[PDB]
Amino acid sequence: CFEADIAIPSGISRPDAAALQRCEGRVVFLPTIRRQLALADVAHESFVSGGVSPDTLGLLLAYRRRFPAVITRVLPTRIVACPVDLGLTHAGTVNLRNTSPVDLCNGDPVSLVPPVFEGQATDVRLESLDLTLRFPVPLPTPLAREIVARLVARGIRDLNPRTPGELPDLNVLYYNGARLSLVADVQQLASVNTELRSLVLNMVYSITEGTTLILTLIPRLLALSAQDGYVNALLQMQSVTREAAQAPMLMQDGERRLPLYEALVAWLAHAGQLGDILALAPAVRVCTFDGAAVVQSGDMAPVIRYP
Amino acid sequence: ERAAVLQAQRTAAAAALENAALQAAELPVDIERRIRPIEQQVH
Amino acid sequence: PRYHLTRQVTLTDLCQPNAERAGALLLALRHPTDLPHLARHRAPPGRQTERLAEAWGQLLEASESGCARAGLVSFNFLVAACAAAYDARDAAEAVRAHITTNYAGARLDRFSECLRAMVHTHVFPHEVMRFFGGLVSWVTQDELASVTAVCSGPQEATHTGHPVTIPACAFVDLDAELCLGGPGAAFLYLVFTYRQCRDQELCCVYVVKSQLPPRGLEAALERLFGRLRITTCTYAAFAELGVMPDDSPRCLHRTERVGVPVVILEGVVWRPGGWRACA
Amino acid sequence: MNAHFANEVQYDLTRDPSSPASLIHVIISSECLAAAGVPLSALVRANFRVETQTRAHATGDCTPWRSAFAAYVPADAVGAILAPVIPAHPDLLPRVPSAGGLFVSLPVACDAQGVYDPYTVAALRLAWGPWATCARVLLFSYDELVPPNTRYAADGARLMRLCRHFCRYVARLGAAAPAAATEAAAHLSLGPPISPEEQLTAPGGDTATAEDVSITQENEEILALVQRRSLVEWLDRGWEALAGGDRPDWLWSRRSISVVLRHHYGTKQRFVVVSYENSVAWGGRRARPPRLSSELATALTEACAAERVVRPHQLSPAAQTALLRRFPALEGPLRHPRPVLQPFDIAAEVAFVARIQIACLRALGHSIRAALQGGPRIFQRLRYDFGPHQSEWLGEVTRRFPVLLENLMRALEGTAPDAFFHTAYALAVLAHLGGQLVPLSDDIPARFADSDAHYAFDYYSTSGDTLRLTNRPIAVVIDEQSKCRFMEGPHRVCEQYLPGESYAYLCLGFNRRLCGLVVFPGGFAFTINTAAYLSLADPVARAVGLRFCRGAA
């Protein structure tokens, strides 16, 4: 585990000692690797920057440059945390707590998302030690990648107004059913802006010279549309692909460079990496020993290493 | 209301001096290259 | 299982670990007889791909492969060969006074040409010469080699930490990043910083010093650089050299084996990591 | 340097816009800011925002405020482009010093086959902060800004001195130069300080020179009868070894640079007109052929100079319309009954302002008489209780009273109108002319546009001299009786009190309803219907508001 401890610094509200008991299996973001550390850098008051608190995109950027840690065992003197970034060498598969409305799967990669849900705030309050605690919500990673694209684009609509007030909310989610509504309260600009620029600048490099030949086959896409099932379902209705349909540009130097093969490389370099440069890295994977295929809300799932 | 305009036109005409004086900075200049290397040809 | 051994049989045409120290940060030479082909491929055609066809071919002139393949590249062999390249001269060049008096610049001069030729046709020296380890034993013969230089996690610097103490081999190397100092553990990485057609295909080898995650290292790779002035692209690759789980045991010395500045680093979790090169 | 360069990236936009345009580099120096009213210390405290808008001379509207760039560097601003500074090698080019200021290039309104319109003004605005007190406005016509040609002849002496100073730096320093720098020096020898001010004052410029080849080919012909890699590529390694990088800021310090001196028609000042070679801006040798035409600056002049017509409203009727048959955009300044901008005058934008200064004072002055027709009954409007001997202070205020209301209006006359637009009444009308749109500098709070109970005050000194004691319009929410209340929120003395709270203060508030207050100490105040006296014609006022409003996002 390469054991790391966090002590109980000063006093105890006597029911709130039991509040630390039911947080077993949650995640602490501690911005270090320590053998002992105070509880002051733990809470959300440390997540608050100079003067201002981060938004749910800034908390992504706040959870960027800190280190997650697993609650292992809860003492009245200390709390032993295992440093996820290094000390994931656990054949004992140190256990986590699922605090999420989604019943997951077996075999999901699990990445951490700030509490942004309408009813799972994960707000526990300490008044003897005046601190506020937001636990991250562990979620499956495609469902995690369906969230971060919404919240930045919702903040993309925070730059430009123009349109009438009835906008698509980006606030109805879909997992097999299960209509989810999240919170849209505040959108800090710099958390939107720096997230928007890497969405711009990576999509710059992901276009290359041999990429341009693919753009010719855009009318070839709709030729498969009215003659099969798979393509017509692949072609989205709310897509620009159905909108843009309504050429080599020769410039041929040398022609032994494999121009089409080189196109799919650098496109995958930056447009292939769009979930992980915006959000947190997944290192938690669902692995139950008993053959249980799903893990209930509130359960203690065994946790294995990087996916 | 006139005194601002009658000053601002006067400041323009004061600036239009050196707008024209620097434009008239070629009248002792445009003559040397059109006379001097032509006379030693006559020589 | 927190103790491992690895072994590769190569020549002493490369590193000559008998001429090295007990602690050296060895590279392999994976794909050793490679790169006439990838000289031709992966590059735009304004690079004149007939250069690396001869360039590595002059390297093994200084060094027929036989049954002992060319490998086990030293840590010294890149620092001194790029000593004339990157922004340190007469101090990085002391690594050349370390090599040519103990190892040979004949093999450097063919390879410093490769360091202008590999980077020329976009055949970048990351993902070739992959990490091998810290030179545990040197059971080599006279002109041949048989080295055990274990990979495989923290055990290289425990089984040379319960006893080589991991030099940095140049004080210019071990880049003192994070002068904003605090307590914790050190996270070591292997970055090749480039300059493409500005300094005519620059080569660089140095180790960074950070208490930073891989997600807090890429923006740290965009900041602190002055070699952005390029446009081709895909500069500044890096992999994980692993964790030094102590910032207290770093040192500052100039005594080795020619007086070469050197940094003692005791106790390292050698997480072998993975490379990344896109921008 | 780069503020001239990054604005060209905004010139790399537009694509196919409403009107094809240009871009002129304009370097204002120190005293052209100082005589304008710009504090040089506050901009010295490099990328800085400039809000710009462009204005026609004859009629019409204006541009909205465009966010631009700046580089205010105290140096030899001509000499810094010419002799730049490497961090390791600042003595790469020793020079002669000069004055300095802001580096701002400015765009140009043109036509299809562009004939630029002189007398038409682009307006600068430097914003030190939010407030109108942290603002100045600058005037520039295209007669002021556009020379016919540049002076890249001064660039000829500069470039070979560069090669000699690479021949000068390595020979002085010696072996301390690295391996790429010890080469490129002697490759410039096989091919005194640099005073940048001599490139302005040596009488030489541009020429087509095709007439100057035939005038020399028929001049060297007689002599003949009687008788019967470059250096610039070594300049790159000159920079790439001494700097260690490319620096596209310094890349156009090697190419063709023209440095032209011009002058300012407002305050007798000088400034600089700059064009590089590789600039897509005006005077660049990489630009779009349709640029500028100096035709309006020759038509209306010579048709009035050969006819000796001193003012072209005294132009002859055939001499009017024949120019109208040539250039058709002049129907505005010649055939409009009452244009809201004055046709053919230098201070036509200034006389546009001074009317508004006049027309409000009569709207003030005939409204002050309105509520004060006869002997008034004002009794009071605020709640301030007295001590017993404090009433004898108001015994003076009986006697003191009528001299003030002259001297308030005297001081309202006594201000400059440029200094009047920073006060509360000049913006409360703009909060009402936007209600007949967010006015400039955003001094208006978020809750001024809610009620009519949100007033906005100015403060004048009662005793001594009758002088203004504010920078800020102090907006005090006012509730028979009604007690006062402030709003929400670099240090000015009088800004701490309620209106009319104490002696030696005259308080003067206004509304979006434009029913104002004159608050005296002791509750003794009264409303004024200035809305019954504001006579601002909307087509006159619509050129007023657009130059003074800001489109809020």
TrEMBL record, chain A:
GO molecular function: structural molecule activity
Superkingdom per UniProt: Viruses
Disulfide bridge partners, by residue number: 1-82
Record-linked InterPro entries: Herpes_capsid_2 (IPR002690)
Keyword Membrane: no
UniProt GO cellular component terms: viral capsid
Keyword presence, Oxidoreductase: no
Keyword terms, alphabetized: Capsid protein, Host nucleus, Virion
Name of a matching Pfam family: Herpes_V23
The protein's name: Capsid triplex subunit 2
Source species taxonomy: Viruses, Duplodnaviria, Heunggongvirae, Peploviricota, Herviviricetes
Gene giving rise to this polypeptide: UL18
From TrEMBL, chain C:
Gene Ontology biological-process entries: viral capsid assembly
Disulfide links within the chain: 82-203
Record-level GO cellular component terms: viral capsid
UniProt keyword terms in alphabetical order: Capsid protein, Host nucleus, Virion
Gene Ontology molecular function: any one: DNA binding
Official protein name in the record: Capsid triplex subunit 1
Species for this entry: Human herpesvirus 2
Gene label: UL38
Full-sequence portion shown in this chain: 106 to 466 of 466
